[PDB]
Amino acid sequence: SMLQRDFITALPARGLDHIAENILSYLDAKSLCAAELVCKEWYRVTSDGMLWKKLIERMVRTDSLWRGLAERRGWGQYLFKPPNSFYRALYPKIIQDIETIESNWRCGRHSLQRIHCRSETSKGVYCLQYDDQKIVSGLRDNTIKIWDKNTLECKRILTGHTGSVLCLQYDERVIITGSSDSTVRVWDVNTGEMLNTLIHHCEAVLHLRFNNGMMVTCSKDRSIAVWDMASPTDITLRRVLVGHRAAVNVVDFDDKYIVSASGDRTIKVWNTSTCEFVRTLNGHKRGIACLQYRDRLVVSGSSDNTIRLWDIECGACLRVLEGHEELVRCIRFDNKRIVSGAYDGKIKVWDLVAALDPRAPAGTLCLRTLVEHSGRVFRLQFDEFQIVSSSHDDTILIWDFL
């Protein structure tokens, strides 16, 4: 047995080049640069192996930020079937680009586009969801308006609800909406055709989520309904969850748990499979207006003006976020940030990693306050590059940090 062995030289020597490339593909950028300078054969392996191309592709595959820039900047055109050195020179430009995006977030530097929804009578946009093509928005005038993400023009008005459209979600096939008229409606996302109406709740349907054959709805009538969707036209009630003592303002779920929150000041956790009560999250001093749940993290916003972070398994509150001056009315988070909107029209950006580290002081947690709405902020969604928010002031704002 030899004491030492040049793996990266020996393997290609033996006609096993791909193994050597695979070893090097695990390196971070700085270690791949180091490998380049080890010796001539190491350099040749990295160059002939297109390792910088392979490294950028691994990032695009594993990081939506890298994925987003590849699409938004156009260098993604060269990826997934221009020599290796092109990718080597591109990599630092991407790093600096991320840094400038992160700086814009930290410093609140952005451009702003403003859609005036021009509601004739009852003003305000209660809910919204967006992709790269469109913004689908729900309005206090009883309609759903679909906006083109690029031209900001109105492409479709969906009528049928007899009251405000309070909540909505869509996927590649359908739009599903809940309304002050106590109904849930299902619309064709392409044509707008009404496909189904669910008559179940006795009071306004305040929130819903659905994905992969199931839907959860919740209502001012203090109940949660769990639905099985075999198709847009075959939707069956599986179970009704009761136990909340006031309107259920929001519901979220995944394969582990259903999570509901209420005017009764509590968050409740239910087993998605069994619909059995699991546990109550106590702690907010007032009713809860908004919530998001993913993985182990629950994020809630309340009439007590605070935000609370919770781990779903033990129910512990991990952090209380203070700073909003009015009711926290909508909230979202991703892997880096929390974004919340309040009754005073203000939006706050929070550092989620910092917030989940109990060493960090509270005053360092709010990165920026963004003030461009003139009424209550009802809904927002965001990603690495932008925020889309909507308000009682009858506008939708896109805040763009790129």
Binding site: L166, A204, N249
Partner: peptide, 11 residues
Amino acid sequence: YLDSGIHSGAT
């Protein structure tokens, strides 16, 4: 007053 989207424990 509150928006139609949310409600408290009142009755």
